Paper text:
Well-dispersed signals for 113 of 114 nonproline residues were observed by 1H-15N-HSQC NMR spectroscopy for uniformly 15N-labeled NΔ30 Ddn protein, suggesting a well-defined three-dimensional structure. This sample also showed significant chemical shift perturbation upon addition of oxidized or reduced coenzyme F420, demonstrating tight binding of the coenzyme and suggesting that this construct adopts a physiologically relevant form. As expected (Manjunatha et al., 2006a; Taylor et al., 2010), the backbone trace shows high similarity to proteins in the split barrel-like family of flavin-binding proteins. The initial structure was then used to solve the structure of the longer NΔ30 construct by molecular replacement based on a 1.55 Å data set (Apo-1 in Table 1) and of a 1.85 Å resolution NΔ33 crystal (P3221 space group; Apo-2 in Table 1). All but the first five amino-terminal residues could be built into the electron density for both crystal forms (36–151 and 39–151, respectively). The asymmetric units (ASUs) for the Apo-1 and Apo-2 crystals both contain single molecules with similar structures (root-mean-square deviation [rmsd] is 0.96 Å). This alignment omits 14 of 113 shared Cα atoms because of conformational differences in the same regions that differ upon coenzyme binding. In Apo-1 and Apo-2, α helix D is highly disrupted, with repositioning of residues 129–144 relative to the holo-enzyme structures complementing movement of the post-β3 loop. In Apo-1, the side chain of Y136 is flipped away from the F420 binding site, with the oxygen atom moving 19 Å relative to the Holo-1 structure.
Author numbering: 36 to 151
The structure:
């Protein structure tokens, strides 16, 4: 039950710009890569809705993603509903800690597409 992670769980470091500060903030997140896109997500919503990184990128879509030692400059947007339903099962399959197949239906769980 290692899913798709083998012996190393993949995590991306997302840098967003503070919506009040205009200074960078970094957050480790699970992700998928889909061609040139990087999809990032949180696994919890409800009390954890609207984390700072998400609010930052809603205000300013320019982000950086570091995966291993690769650094990408990307632009972020919400996954559309179709994309939520398409990518969430892939995240469930990849990561053993993502277990609820239907959590994509809860809009308080952010799912963000970062593209070039």
């Amino acid at each position: 039950g290692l899913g798709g992670t083998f012996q190393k769980i993949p995590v991306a470091l997302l840098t967003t710009t503070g919506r009040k500060t205009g200074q960078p903030r970094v957050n480790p997140l699970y992700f998928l890569r889909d061609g040139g896109r990087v999809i990032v997500a949180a696994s919890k919503g409800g009390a954890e809705k609207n984390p700072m990184w998400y609010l930052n990128l809603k205000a300013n879509p320019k982000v950086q993603v570091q995966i291993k030692k690769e650094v990408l400059d990307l632009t972020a947007r919400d996954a559309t509903d179709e994309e939520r339903a398409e990518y969430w099962p892939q995240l469930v399959t990849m990561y053993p800690s993502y277990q609820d197949y239907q959590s994509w239906t809860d809009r308080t769980i952010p799912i963000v597409v970062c593209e070039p």
